[PDB]
Amino acid sequence: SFSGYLKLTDNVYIKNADIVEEAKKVKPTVVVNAANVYLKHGGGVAGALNKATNNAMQVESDDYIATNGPLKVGGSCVLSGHNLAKHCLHVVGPNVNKGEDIQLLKSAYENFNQHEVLLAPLLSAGIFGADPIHSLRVCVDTVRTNVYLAVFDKNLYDKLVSSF
Numbered sequence: 001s002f003s004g005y006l007k008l009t010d011n012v013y014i015k016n017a018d019i020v021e022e023a024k025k026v027k028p029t030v031v032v033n034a035a036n037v038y039l040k041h042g043g044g045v046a047g048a049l050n051k052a053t054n055n056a057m058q059v060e061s062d063d064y065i066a067t068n069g070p071l072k073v074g075g076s077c078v079l080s081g082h083n084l085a086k087h088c089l090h091v092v093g094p095n096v097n098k099g100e101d102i103q104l105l106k107s108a109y110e111n112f113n114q115h116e117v118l119l120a121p122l123l124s125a126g127i128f129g130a131d132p133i134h135s136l137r138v139c140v141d142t143v144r145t146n147v148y149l150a151v152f153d154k155n156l157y158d159k160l161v162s163s164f
């Protein structure tokens with residue numbers, strides 16, 4: 001099971017960890033990817049998860065997009081978790097660097113409520129450009145299922161806990 005997490009609320013937990021290493025250790029039922037609408041896993045959490053699957057996540061994702069077209073900002077799809085998890089929930093939070101609406105962050109977190117427990121990153125944080133303190137607030141006020149947040153950056157983890 002999950003270990004070494006700090007409890008923030010009844011259902012939200014947080015740890016300073018690399019989500020790839022956490023997924024390889026725990027083999028959760030669901031790992032969340034910080035996806036874009038095209039499922040092009042180039043950088044950030046998506047690039048790191050895809051590299052850990054030896055590009056199998058990108059080959060499956062390209063077939064999904066060829067069949068279904070792009071996701072919506074704030075939407076998600078469930079695909080294989082490959083060697084990392086049973087499933088990967090690809091969730092698209094708004095990318096502030098591309099000018100997307102930050103109000104869509106709550107819609108993005110609502111996708112997590114379809115799964116009893118998830119290993120996840122903070123949506124729209126990092127290279128997506130939003131304030132991670134805001135992302136954690138929307139996560140706690142939106143997600144009702146059990147979420148284990150992995151924050152890679154130690155300095156950001158300490159700021160997120162100390163300002164919670």
Ligand SMILES: Cc1ccc(S(=O)(=O)Nc2ccccc2F)cc1C(=O)Nc1cnc2[nH]ncc2c1
Pocket residue numbers: 034043044045121122125126127128129130131132151152153156
């Ligand atoms: C800058 C940074 C570096 C590294 C990490 S990470 O390694 O924890 N995660 C991570 C890295 C890449 C892709 C996606 C990820 F989630 C996060 C951040 C972060 O979000 N900081 C931060 C702090 N205050 C801010 N205010 N407004 C914006 C803003 C951003």
